[PDB]
Subunit: 237 residues, 4 copies
């Protein structure tokens, strides 16, 4: 299977698999059962912002999710990515729905990664910023039900003609170029990601969530990973 | 077949195909016969720097090549890239040798492209910086004789284990991710590229040169494009 | 006597001193009488964007002003800044009103300057971005009627608590740190500036305009430089 | 007195005031007696690099110092800068010598600070990079014995005409523009600083060290702060 490290914006509580009894943000390391979570007050129909950061000095993965004029939610977890992910990876966004649904619209997404060599202290870096998505975005790899173009946004999951989100949907978008996330021969390594989203649902219980993830370069949506699996894992192990 | 826009650092004069009688830098628009050139005092064995810039406001492609403590060579050409290249392209470096040779070593390469929407005025951007190249640089597509790893450098053309250049060689390196170079519905579009090189040759007359180029995404080294064709064109038309 | 280089967004035509008979954007080099102008379709009440760029390779100062979903206006002028401005300067925004008025509200302002050494080929750079202004913005030098705080915006000229513009007003805002705009020992040098503005007026003829300028570090609003002088020049010579 | 937050590269152990019995790097919060330290293998005559980082999500100040092809030293400390420093500050570098001496040469220095609004989620930023220091660097405030120009470097402490470092010297360099380090109404605040240095001494025990610091905007060298006080504190409390 693929190797996944992700930050999830979980909108639906699946208490039988470790989720707390309320929407939450979490840090997932090779498992959908978050290693750490924090309560999240998701606002249906409002544009939110998620910021993820990691640096090899502290080797701590943190994330903060918030809405304009509102208290934010934050979660952090100490993890050595050199022992979890392959040297080269691809980064992306994923989302899913199951019995319950919601729109999983991405309005913007930026990412920056830097690697400083230990031998010459020279830096290698990558940065990309999307504030508008095109109908034919060649620098993005769309998987599953993900689509771009409508209103210049990226719709990770299926949305019908009348604008209603569909259930049992899963979709992801990965940046085309592989990213050198870590190198034993580097003095300092770090990355940051930011994305704005719009989660809207008709029912009282929206599902299932959105996640920023990092994985092996040839990663694909695990078959049947709709619902609680967030298009990231093959099972709930 | 391929669509090419490039800035050439032509070290060998091929006066039979439009080249001036001296090393020069030039702007090539869909043809190896530069639309504009400038005399270049290449210094065999010294590390040089090349800077290329373009913006849709002025629709002018300019380049400056220089060596520390020496007069620089500059060349500019008016050109609307919207009417020359396809919307999406790939950027890279190319180099070749023929009867005569030279090392076509790249010590660093950076690139930045920005596109501003005409509707929301928001910007999309891409930036990458290579100050060290590794044996397995996954975010680079290597073609022909290009290799990476030795001394953390990118050798565009064939060189022995000691550093001796070989003739009849051609190689290119392209950034993995496609770049959205121009968009009709964009207020301003621009890009810049910078690369440091080391051209060293044992013979009196080195050849054939190095070039920074922009092409269709599926661009490949044209058959037989060694020597004077710099691995960019199929013929000298 | 200050040394001024500026890009003006001239809303009121003063034909007695060289202005064309319509709103326009122009490049002013040590004189309010623009060296080059372009027709500008100012839209009263709407937020617009102005982008200014200059690079030592081409030695050309260009600017583009536009409003979402509308054609833009562009003006360019070839000028060697090392022969016009002192090596060190301060950058800022200025605006004024006279018999007629308008709000000269700045919603955001960014600037980036780079100087690359000719001996070591290394670069010095400065970048600042203001997407929100505070009541006490310590990194900004406010002159005349300029104030910060109201709705997180920078009001260059006097406005009432409700938003009504006042006549006979002049104000400027300069970045606190001096900028090394040019250095003889530099291979390449360049800068870019961007700002969003909101010009609204109750009368049929708004005045007088907004300008992005570069001046000697100790520059101040010339005595009586309200109205047509845009707070930049002592007279209309 | 001033309010100081700093990262010290302490080359001389003063065990009577809390220093460990070996050169070290430390985090100083309003006191020369570091809140946290780490063993540092300083290499006399070699160019080293220091990287400092801080972010409001983890509220952790970290620093890493190293030399090419050698293990690095790292120190991290939990601290909420919002409760230690004033809203606006100035950043700089300081160094000193006492009975024993060393050259406290700075070859490069960069800094970046970002503040994201909680009501608009828009960010304000500042970035500066010095790879070359000029004899008259107007964007730098030099204090005490600090000088610039010699070989394009910044000499924090006095060096004789023969190139020998002098004892009982103290000097600092602060960036001209004040920096908005924290803002209650900001969702995320962060900053990073990097600088290369060259510490050389004929002595068997060089002294006293270099430090990157953040202080009140009107900060000046405390009288008599040579030696173990690193030009940052008035006493060793
Ligand atoms: C029949 O009940 C079980 O299945 C429904 C529907 O599950 C699908 O839809 C949800 C929401 O989109 C996805 O998260 C799932 O992966 C499926 O795709 C669940 O809603 C039920 O959950 C409720 O009951 C559980 C058992 O007590 C509890 O743990 C949950 O937190 C929730 O209260 C239930 C899921 C069984 O795994
Ligand atoms: C026999 O002479 C012709 O061929 C040689 C060798 O050409 C190959 O090597 C060069 C240098 O690496 C490459 O640029 C070519 O593409 C081939 O790979 C050339 O050196 C000769 O050029 C000289 O003579 C020309 C006159 O015929 C003159 O125009 C050139 O400027 C140069 O002085 C020559 C090339 C014929 O096309
Ligand atoms: C009495 O007329 C002259 O003065 C008025 C008022 O000038 C003040 O207000 C304007 C607009 O805010 C500022 O630009 C000035 O600097 C003063 O502060 C001007 O409006 C008049 O201009 C008109 O008439 C001119 C002469 O025919 C003509 O050239 C202008 O284009 C305009 O049509 C006039 C200005 C004399 O200098
Ligand atoms: C007489 O000894 C005391 O003073 C000398 C000189 O101090 C000055 O120079 C040093 C080095 O440049 C600076 O750090 C000081 O601030 C003064 O400017 C010190 O070298 C002595 O230190 C040694 O002895 C101490 C007492 O046992 C010990 O704690 C130190 O670690 C060191 O071994 C000494 C300092 C008294 O405070
Ligand atoms: Ca869940
Ligand atoms: Ca040639
Ligand atoms: Ca006018
Ligand atoms: Ca000490
Ligand atoms: Mn969960
Ligand atoms: Mn040529
Ligand atoms: Mn005018
Ligand atoms: Mn100490």
């Amino acid at each position: 299977a693929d190797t996944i490290v992700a930050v999830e914006l979980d909108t639906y509580p699946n208490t039988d698999i470790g989720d707390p009894s309320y929407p939450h943000i979490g840090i997932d390391i090779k498992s959908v059962r978050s290693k750490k979570t924090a309560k999240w007050n998701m606002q249906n129909g409002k544009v939110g912002t998620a910021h993820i950061i990691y640096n090899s000095v502290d080797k701590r993965l943190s994330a903060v999710v918030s809405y304009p004029n509102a208290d934010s939610a934050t979660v952090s977890y100490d993890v050595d990515l050199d022992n979890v992910l392959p040297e080269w990876v691809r980064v992306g966004l994923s989302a899913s729905t199951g019995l319950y649904k919601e729109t999983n619209t991405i309005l913007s997404w930026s990412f920056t990664s830097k690697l400083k060599s230990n031998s010459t202290h020279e830096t290698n870096a990558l940065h990309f910023m999307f504030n508008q998505f095109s109908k034919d975005q060649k620098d993005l790899i769309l998987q599953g039900d993900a689509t771009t173009g409508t209103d210049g946004n990226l719709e990770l999951t299926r949305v019908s003609s009348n604008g209603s989100p569909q259930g049992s949907s899963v979709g992801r978008a990965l940046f085309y170029a592989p990213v050198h996330i870590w190198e034993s021969s580097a003095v300092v390594a770090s990355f940051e990601a930011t994305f704005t989203f719009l989660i809207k649902s008709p029912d009282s219980h929206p599902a299932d969530g959105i996640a920023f993830f990092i994985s092996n370069i040839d990663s694909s949506i695990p078959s049947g990973s709709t619902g609680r699996l967030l298009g990231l894992f093959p099972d709930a192990n």
